[PDB]
């Protein structure tokens, strides 16, 4: 899903940058139960920064 | 003795494309 999205015209590269220089390239959002299942299943990829 | 214009008129640019251009700069990343 994250690869299939394309780019945009007016993208600001100085906005929504996290610590350690990495760049946020989108946002996914779901309900609380699906989020809890993804958190409890993929805890080896989810950090808190 | 009638009073014709001296030379041709010179065109003016309206001050409304200024607030069009600033509103289009607001969509872009930054004015400065």
């Amino acid at each position: 899903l994250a690869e299939a999205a394309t780019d945009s015209i007016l993208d600001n590269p100085t906005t929504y940058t996290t610590s350690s220089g990495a760049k946020i390239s989108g946002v996914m959002v779901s309900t609380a139960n699906v989020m809890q299942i993804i958190m409890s299943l993929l805890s080896s990829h989810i950090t808190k920064e | 003795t009638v009073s014709a214009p001296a030379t041709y008129g010179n065109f003016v640019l309206s001050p409304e494309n200024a607030v069009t251009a600033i509103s289009y700069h607001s969509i872009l990343a930054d004015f400065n």
């Binding site: 015209i9 | 200024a18 600033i22 700069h25 930054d30």
Partner: peptide, 16 residues
């Protein structure tokens, strides 16, 4: 007028 009608940054966009 240069910064006003044509824009801030000449790269990745222009005002035509």
């Amino acid at each position: 007028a240069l910064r006003i009608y044509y824009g801030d940054d000449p790269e990745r966009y222009n005002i035509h």
